[PDB]
Amino acid sequence: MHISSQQHEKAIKSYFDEAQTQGVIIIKEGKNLSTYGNALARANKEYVPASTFKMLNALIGLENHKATTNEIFKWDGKKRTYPMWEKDMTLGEAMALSADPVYQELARRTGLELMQKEVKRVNFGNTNIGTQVDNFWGPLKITPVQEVNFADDLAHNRLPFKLETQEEVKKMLLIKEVNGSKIYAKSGWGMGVTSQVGWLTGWVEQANGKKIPFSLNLEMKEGMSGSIRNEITYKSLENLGII
Numbered sequence: 001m002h003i004s005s006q007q008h009e010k011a012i013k014s015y016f017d018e019a020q021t022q023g024v025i026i027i028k029e030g031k032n033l034s035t036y037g038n039a040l041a042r043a044n045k046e047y048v049p050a051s052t053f054k055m056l057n058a059l060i061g062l063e064n065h066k067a068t069t070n071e072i073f074k075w076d077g078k079k080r081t082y083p084m085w086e087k088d089m090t091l092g093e094a095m096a097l098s099a100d101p102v103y104q105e106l107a108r109r110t111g112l113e114l115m116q117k118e119v120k121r122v123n124f125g126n127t128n129i130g131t132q133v134d135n136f137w138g139p140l141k142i143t144p145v146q147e148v149n150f151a152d153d154l155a156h157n158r159l160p161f162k163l164e165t166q167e168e169v170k171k172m173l174l175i176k177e178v179n180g181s182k183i184y185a186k187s188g189w190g191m192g193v194t195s196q197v198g199w200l201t202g203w204v205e206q207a208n209g210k211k212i213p214f215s216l217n218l219e220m221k222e223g224m225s226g227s228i229r230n231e232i233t234y235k236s237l238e239n240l241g242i243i
């Protein structure tokens with residue numbers, strides 16, 4: 001890689017242009033944030049976290065003894081938006097499937113009051129979870145910079161939760177293994193006032209133990225497959241030589 005920064009920026013901008021979306025992908029190396037993509041001003045704008053919030057819901061539920069990691073959440077038998085959710089599952093399984101009913105149940109066990117306190121204590125986003133404990137991941141919003149930093153915190157065990165709570169949640173987030181590098185992350189897709197947001201927020205753990213946090217953020221459009229979030233992310237990390 002004698003590749004110019006101009007060429008990196010152009011290549012990653014083109015992965016967003018080809019998907020016909022507007023988005024950004026923030027990469028963090030040590031303390032330095034780099035911003036890539038075809039809509040850089042997204043970096044400090046606020047969007048609903050949607051399902052990226054499952055990472056924090058899990059940390060809170062575990063820290064506070066609302067569940068354990070091997071506990072099986074039974075499917076209640078009612079029809080689900082997706083068949084894959086019609087099954088009994090652990091928090092970790094529900095993370096990978098982004099299964100809402102499980103994370104909703106966990107949120108209800110935690111309850112609105114404790115969820116409020118705990119979201120303030122962690123200072124996640126704008127920190128407002130409103131009056132509904134299972135529908136809030138509006139008015140809670142967060143920026144892509146704030147997401148990559150949250151990812152940075154979790155990857156290095158700096159959030160204010162016990163170490164073992166943080167390691168337990170990190171084990172849930174492994175979504176890919178590419179050439180001795182592991183990718184931990186959580187996806188999101190939220191409907192906002194007039195637009196949809198897509199997220200993929202996590203970190204690359206390299207063979208040598210180095211951790212590189214990232215947050216992809218983009219506009220989802222009718223018709224898009226969700227796996228475009230992953231594909232843009234993996235191409236970008238690869239172009240940068242990070243995986």
Ligand SMILES: *C(=O)[C@@H](NC(=O)/C(=N/OC(C)(C)C(=O)O)c1csc(N)n1)[C@H](C)NS(=O)(=O)O
Nearest residue numbers: 048050051052098137138187188189190191226
């Ligand atoms: C998690 O992000 C989850 N997203 C949602 O359930 C929300 N969805 O809105 C969609 C896009 C499905 C819709 O058209 O209604 C949501 C939660 S809070 C908010 N403002 N919107 C998805 C399905 N899981 S994921 O892994 O695909 O991201």
